Amino acid sequence: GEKIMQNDRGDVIIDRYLTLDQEFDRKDDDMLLHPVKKIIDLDGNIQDD
Amino acid sequence: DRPIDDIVKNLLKFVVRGFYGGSFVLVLDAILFHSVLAEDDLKQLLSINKTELGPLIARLRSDRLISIHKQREERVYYYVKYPHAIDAIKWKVHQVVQRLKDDLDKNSEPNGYMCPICLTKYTQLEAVQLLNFDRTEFLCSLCDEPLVEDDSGKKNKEKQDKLNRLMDQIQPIIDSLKKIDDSRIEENTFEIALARLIPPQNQSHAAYTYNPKKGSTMFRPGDSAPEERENEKTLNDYYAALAKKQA
Amino acid sequence: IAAAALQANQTDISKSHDSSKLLWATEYIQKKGKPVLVNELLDYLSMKKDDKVIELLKKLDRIEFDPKKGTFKYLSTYDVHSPSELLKLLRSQVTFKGISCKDLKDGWPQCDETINQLEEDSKILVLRTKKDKTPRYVWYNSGGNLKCIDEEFVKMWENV
Amino acid sequence: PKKEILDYLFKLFDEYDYWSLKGLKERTRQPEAHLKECLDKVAT
Amino acid sequence: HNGAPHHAIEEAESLLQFHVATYMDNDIAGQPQALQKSGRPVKSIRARLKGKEGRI
Amino acid sequence: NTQPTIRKDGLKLVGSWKKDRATGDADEPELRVLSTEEILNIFKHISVKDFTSLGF
């Protein structure tokens, strides 16, 4: 839970995996997507009008 | 990543394939297929020279397509500045569109005249002020030559058709521009291309890393973002029982 | 009498170097268009036993022993002799390194004509010289046709 | 004299692995185009 | 426009700026003189307009 | 941003941004020859207002 900062240099060897972790995040979010019940669907609620 | 970036890359491929040389096609395809590259790595990959490289790189700088990066490790790298590139493309297509539209508008006008002795064109109004006393034809002021009409009236439909078919050819670029305007663009940097480094070689001389400087304020343009088998088992247990006995 | 002169000038197989013997053997393999058996070697170099030379010839990647029969076959640079295989190779490319026509002629001597007709098909990215259209390093046509926009429109574009 | 100079080259680079062209030329006294096409066929 | 190795550019533009500076004036701080054939230096516009019968 | 200290020299202009904003004293003056192009651009980026103040 730390905001990234360009003042921090990090470790280059570990931070090469940054975009790999990013595309892992994208793939995982893709996996995590699922249809929602209309009884609680705020997307349907905001798509009322 | 985002498919709109992929559309941008394929747009660049289509644009160069339709408007530039094969060498430009190869260079831009290679540097998109890879990332920021050193010059000697390009010479290794394409087996080329600085003599051949010069005009192509110069033209790519002229169209503001690929920003050139230099750093000391001096090692020279190259990356496509996306917003400056698309703004240059938009400006060029806008200029082409306005140019050809005004060409068609001007070609819809009366063609005019010329005096072929002095090889000087004459407008319709210049013909009007240069008429004879007979109110029939027009005589030149210097060569005193009867004015002969310009030949562009049949060219009006030809330029219209060239405009139409050129718009048809350029239409995928227009659609990609529309999708780009739908999208929101993040500006390319050298270190951004470093984050998407695509190494061609395992023997490249260049250290494709960014090494920043402290105590420096150097500002420059182009950088701006404001059973049997059971037995052996039981014999295995026989060995283990004997092994635990001595222990 | 020419045959007698050639027989007198025929250097014995006991050359100064086993490398020279193996070089002449690789010449004999390359000049034959078929996988030649070990008896062909026993014909060419007049010795019978398995040698360090024969063992290193087996160890050669370009010279492949046949465990089934013994037919030593020359192994080329590329096992591509069809444009379908050539396009599959080009699509299977991992970097933008081009490929010379010479080692492609090795194994596939009728590859240059195929390259020419593929370029006329605009299915490749060939490199040709300026003296003449002499094909060189090639790449896969990742995009559409190279001959895309007509010459007058490209001309007025260059005017732009 | 292809085969003789071929074996002779093998002793020569055995004498010195960085054998130069000029050192090769004085060790041959032969047609140079014939000399150059022999050298690259085996080594540098 | 052709291959620019970025080490002729600087002196080429310096020469261009030098020569237009010379054409404007040849009475500058004495690092150049910029004479033509023959040994008489080229007169620039300041030399044409200076005192004692230069145009004024 | 920080400004240099311009040294007039020859027929061109060099800068020196001491800028004093390192982790230390920043004793790195950017000895950079200012391009005529960038001077032109930054002169294009002046106010009318500012012209009148400067006497243009």
Side-chain angles (χ1 to χ4, degrees), chain C residues 83 86-87 90 101 104-105 108-129 132-138 146-147:
Chain C
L86 199 60
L87 262 70
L90 279 163
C101 293
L104 193 52
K105 276 199 74 58
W108 192 10
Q110 194 296 13
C111 72
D112 297 333
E113 174 182 4
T114 306
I115 277 158
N116 296 357
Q117 61 91 28
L118 275 168
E119 173 59 28
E120 298 303 318
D121 207 8
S122 170
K123 295 283 199 74
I124 49 175
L125 311 181
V126 66
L127 173 60
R128 302 181 180 278
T129 63
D132 51 353
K133 299 288 97 176
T134 300
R136 281 175 287 145
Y137 292 167
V138 291
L146 322 170
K147 25 193 179 181

Side-chain angles (χ1 to χ4, degrees), chain B residues 13-14 17-20 26 29-30 33-34 44-47 59 92 96 99-100 162 165-166 169 199-200, chain C residues 94-98 125 127 137 139 141-146 148-150 152-154 156-158 160:
Chain B
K13 291 180 203 309
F14 173 51
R17 275 172 171 84
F19 281 107
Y20 296 93
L26 268 67
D29 286 348
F33 196 235
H34 295 304
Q44 179 267 345
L45 289 173
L46 294 183
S47 292
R59 192 151 166 87
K92 286 180 72 67
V96 163
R99 169 207 326 272
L100 263 192
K162 283 154 63 49
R165 298 174 295 110
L166 199 52
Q169 288 149 340
Chain C
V94 288
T95 59
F96 211 64
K97 185 52 172 299
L125 311 181
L127 173 60
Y137 292 167
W139 301 268
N141 187 18
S142 172
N145 48 357
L146 322 170
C148 194
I149 312 298
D150 310 334
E152 296 178 353
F153 308 131
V154 173
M156 61 79 71
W157 175 256
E158 294 304 316
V160 171

Side-chain angles (χ1 to χ4, degrees), chain E residues 4-35 39 41-44:
Chain E
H6 208 76
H7 210 54
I9 307 297
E10 297 86 5
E11 57 263 52
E13 69 93 26
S14 85
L15 188 152
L16 188 85
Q17 192 262 352
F18 163 76
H19 265 287
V20 67
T22 304
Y23 152 80
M24 284 313 260
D25 291 332
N26 212 352
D27 53 343
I28 77 175
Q31 52 277 13
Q33 190 40 247
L35 72 164
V42 61
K43 46 202 302 175
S44 44

Side-chain angles (χ1 to χ4, degrees), chain B residues 213-221, chain F residues 1-2 17 19 22 26 28 30 32:
Chain B
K213 184 64 66 67
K214 209 65 64 185
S216 70
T217 187
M218 185 179 288
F219 40 85
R220 280 192 178 94
Chain F
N1 206 346
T2 77
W17 290 253
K19 184 265 289 182
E28 185 255 324
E30 276 83 354
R32 160 167 72 261

Side-chain angles (χ1 to χ4, degrees), chain B:
Chain B
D1 285 347
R2 42 188 180 88
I4 179 62
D5 186 29
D6 293 330
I7 296 299
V8 160
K9 300 190 213 63
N10 306 346
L11 181 63
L12 292 187
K13 291 180 203 309
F14 173 51
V15 159
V16 182
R17 275 172 171 84
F19 281 107
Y20 296 93
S23 297
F24 300 93
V25 172
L26 268 67
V27 161
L28 187 151
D29 286 348
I31 67 178
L32 282 184
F33 196 235
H34 295 304
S35 305
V36 285
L37 293 181
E39 182 167 355
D40 305 331
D41 297 307
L42 292 172
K43 274 207 305 166
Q44 179 267 345
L45 289 173
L46 294 183
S47 292
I48 46 171
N49 291 316
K50 277 79 67 179
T51 71
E52 295 178 354
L53 187 152
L56 319 171
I57 279 292
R59 192 151 166 87
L60 295 171
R61 297 313 104 83
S62 68
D63 281 15
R64 291 184 182 180
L65 301 182
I66 299 103
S67 290
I68 173 170
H69 175 244
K70 325 158 195 185
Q71 70 173 16
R72 196 90 48 182
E73 299 287 337
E74 191 172 70
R75 327 293 152 89
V76 189
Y77 307 125
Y78 311 92
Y79 56 97
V80 180
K81 185 69 64 63
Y82 288 113
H84 281 50
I86 66 160
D87 285 332
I89 288 309
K90 194 201 302 204
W91 190 250
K92 286 180 72 67
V93 67
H94 184 273
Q95 195 38 250
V96 163
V97 161
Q98 295 299 109
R99 169 207 326 272
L100 263 192
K101 173 160 55 185
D102 299 347
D103 166 78
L104 192 53
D105 294 344
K106 184 177 69 175
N107 207 359
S108 162
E109 313 302 313
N111 308 322
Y113 283 80
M114 73 290 292
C115 170
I117 298 183
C118 55
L119 295 172
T120 61
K121 302 283 191 175
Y122 285 87
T123 74
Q124 204 62 239
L125 311 162
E126 291 180 354
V128 173
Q129 285 72 242
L130 276 165
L131 74 165
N132 43 29
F133 186 46
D134 296 331
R135 326 300 168 191
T136 58
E137 269 305 309
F138 322 118
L139 273 298
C140 170
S141 176
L142 194 140
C143 313
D144 212 4
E145 191 256 349
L147 271 297
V148 293
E149 194 171 358
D150 212 334
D151 304 340
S152 285
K154 203 180 66 57
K155 282 206 297 171
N156 177 45
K157 195 183 175 183
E158 315 171 355
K159 294 312 185 174
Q160 178 181 358
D161 189 24
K162 283 154 63 49
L163 182 62
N164 293 321
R165 298 174 295 110
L166 199 52
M167 294 182 286
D168 304 330
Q169 288 149 340
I170 209 161
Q171 189 58 255
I173 300 152
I174 312 297
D175 308 327
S176 300
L177 278 158
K178 286 183 182 165
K179 297 190 75 53
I180 277 155
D181 298 357
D182 299 346
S183 166
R184 189 46 55 234
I185 175 163
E186 191 63 38
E187 184 148 359
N188 189 22
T189 78
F190 159 72
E191 212 158 5
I192 275 171
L194 284 193
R196 213 177 285 160
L197 181 60
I198 306 164
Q201 270 181 111
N202 304 320
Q203 62 275 9
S204 172
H205 67 99
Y208 294 90
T209 61
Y210 183 74
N211 54 4
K213 184 64 66 67
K214 209 65 64 185
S216 70
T217 187
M218 185 179 288
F219 40 85
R220 280 192 178 94
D223 276 337
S224 166
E227 61 192 359
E228 189 54 273
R229 74 177 181 90
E230 302 213 39
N231 274 270
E232 293 95 10
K233 300 294 191 287
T234 354
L235 284 158
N236 176 63
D237 301 331
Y238 284 176
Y239 314 140
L242 294 163
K244 290 185 288 289
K245 177 64 181 68
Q246 294 106 28

Side-chain angles (χ1 to χ4, degrees), chain A residues 3 12 16-17 21 25 27 29 31 35 39 42-43 45:
Chain A
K3 212 144 200 184
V12 185
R16 193 44 204 175
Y17 302 93
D21 210 348
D25 295 350
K27 194 198 299 183
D29 187 74
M31 288 203 177
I39 61 173
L42 291 185
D43 186 25
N45 287 335

